[PDB]
Amino acid sequence: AVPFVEDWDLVQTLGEEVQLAVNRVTEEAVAVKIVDNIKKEICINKMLNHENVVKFYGHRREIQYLFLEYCSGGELFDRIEPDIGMPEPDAQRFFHQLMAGVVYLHGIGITHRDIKPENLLLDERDNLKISDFGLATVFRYNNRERLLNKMCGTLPYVAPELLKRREFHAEPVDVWSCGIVLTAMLAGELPWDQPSDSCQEYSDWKEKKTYLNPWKKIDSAPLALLHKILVENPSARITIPDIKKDRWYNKPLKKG
Numbered sequence: 001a002v003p004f005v006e007d008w009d010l011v012q013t014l015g016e017e018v019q020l021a022v023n024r025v026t027e028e029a030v031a032v033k034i035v036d037n038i039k040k041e042i043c044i045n046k047m048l049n050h051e052n053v054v055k056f057y058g059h060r061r062e063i064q065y066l067f068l069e070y071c072s073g074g075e076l077f078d079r080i081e082p083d084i085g086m087p088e089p090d091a092q093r094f095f096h097q098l099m100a101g102v103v104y105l106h107g108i109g110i111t112h113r114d115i116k117p118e119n120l121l122l123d124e125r126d127n128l129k130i131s132d133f134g135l136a137t138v139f140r141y142n143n144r145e146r147l148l149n150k151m152c153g154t155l156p157y158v159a160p161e162l163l164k165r166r167e168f169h170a171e172p173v174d175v176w177s178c179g180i181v182l183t184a185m186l187a188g189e190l191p192w193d194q195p196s197d198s199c200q201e202y203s204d205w206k207e208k209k210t211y212l213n214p215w216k217k218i219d220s221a222p223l224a225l226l227h228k229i230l231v232e233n234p235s236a237r238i239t240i241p242d243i244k245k246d247r248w249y250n251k252p253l254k255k256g
């Protein structure tokens with residue numbers, strides 16, 4: 001074997017901790033998550049292999065060290081301008097890649113449960129990678145679905161059924177949060193503090209008052225998709241196979 005190839009220098013703090021690690025020999029860059037629940041995160045991470053999900057390389061105990069795909073483009077969070085969002089073609093491309101990642105996770109029976117721009121990272125080519133499976137869990141195993149009951153996520157992104165029902169299907173919840181992310185990308189603001197009866201902004205949406213912000217900043221094509229995603233009844237909410245049939249989803253917008 002080549003000497004020293006197992007040595008990584010921690011050269012930059014990425015967040016809190018997660019450190020940018022660079023290989024002493026090869027100079028390969030990886031992200032190292034250093035945690036002082038972790039057992040489950042590592043286990044699910046071992047199931048993951050998709051171009052729009054952060055790659056898991058391995059772990060070692062010292063304190064646990066998770067070796068993760070490094071995403072040099074940073075968080076999608078930083079691409080969203082307050083009150084503006086981003087160019088619609090860029091948002092569509094990110095949304096395509098987000099759906100690809102979420103379709104993959106759901107296909108292997110995993111739900112992320114906390115999709116939001118801080119957890120969507122970008123590589124050097126601005127390809128989107130779903131990040132951080134510390135709240136993720138199994139919702140399908142041996143081809144049998146298990147209903148969720150744990151309240152978790154981030155309130156502005158969380159689906160209404162989590163707030164009102166004891167149990168709920170996992171997949172519509174991830175679809176909902178993706179819709180909130182799409183709204184954020186297109187409007188540069190979140191539509192409500194939380195999807196509750198007591199929240200005026202959410203009531204306005206259910207009353208279809210789309211002459212109000214953020215909705216009036218959003219073109220009718222993507223808005224129509226959002227009308228199908230941000231549906232209160234999770235059983236009536238659009239599924240991803242049908243999102244893939246949506247007019248805006250399929251609209252040519254962005255050059256290569």
Ligand SMILES: CC(C)(C)c1ccc(C(=O)NNC(=O)Nc2cccc3ccccc23)cc1[N+](=O)[O-]
Binds near residue numbers: 184
């Ligand atoms: C709450 C939401 C809507 C979702 C949000 C709002 C703002 C930010 C944010 O401030 N992101 N950080 C940036 O630096 N955004 C910007 C990108 C490009 C041009 C800009 C020009 C001037 C100022 C900021 C700009 C992040 C998020 N969010 O995802 O949680």
